Amino acid sequence: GSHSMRYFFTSVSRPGRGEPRFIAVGYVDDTQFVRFDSDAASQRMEPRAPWIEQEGPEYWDGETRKVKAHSQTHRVDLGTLRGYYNQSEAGSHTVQRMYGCDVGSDWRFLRGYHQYAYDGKDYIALKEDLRSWTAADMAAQTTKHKWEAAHVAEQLRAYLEGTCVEWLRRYLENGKETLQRTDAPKTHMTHHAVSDHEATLRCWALSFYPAEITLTWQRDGEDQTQDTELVETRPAGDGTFQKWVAVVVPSGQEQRYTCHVQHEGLPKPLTLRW
């Protein structure tokens, strides 16, 4: 299936005690593989997956170097942004940055992205073609000019279209046992009637990987997705994922409601009944 590499950065100002909190994490698909936390003692980029632990010191020096510089940058942005919006220095504020790349089933570059948020809302983002910026408001607009002048978009595009994709493939290869697995959901159903004239059917998908999935109820084989109740895909805490969908059904009529399951790991889509 398709794959992606994504870096996620968060920096939270601490009004009274100096250094921001800064957390950086790298993902390949749904699997976290590196992290940096400015509160931990090593002050280095740390591994989080076995297939990255084979990379030599040059990698770890480079990755710590560049992740420090990301930190320093956000820490100066926190002050800048506070000026742009004229905020007092008594409040805590957040910058988040997210970038990375997607490849298809043939591991061919599909798209790049790079966006930046202030206090949990869009600030500025690289556009789809990766040559232009979209600015959220007036402040971002001034950041747009800075970054145009420094050819930040040109730097990112070269990064996202080459470097990003190239190392993603290396990661995909080095960790192929795990990153390239498909585990099918082990599925099942549970029934429950609140009183005794309507019933709740919950359809479970468990221990699957990768995390994308389709879990739906149909009525009479016709798509009924309004009387349904779904949860967000959660992590099982061991590298696989869980999801369930539920429906209310007037006791005695369940046979025309079935569960519909699609997933990379199944040779064919599953159906369910009680």
Binding site: G62, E63, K66, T73, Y116, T143, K146, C164
Partner: peptide, 10 residues
């Protein structure tokens, strides 16, 4: 691999 960010302040 992280982006080599240099002078990318807002």
């Amino acid at each position: 691999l992280l982006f080599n960010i240099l002078g990318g302040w807002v």
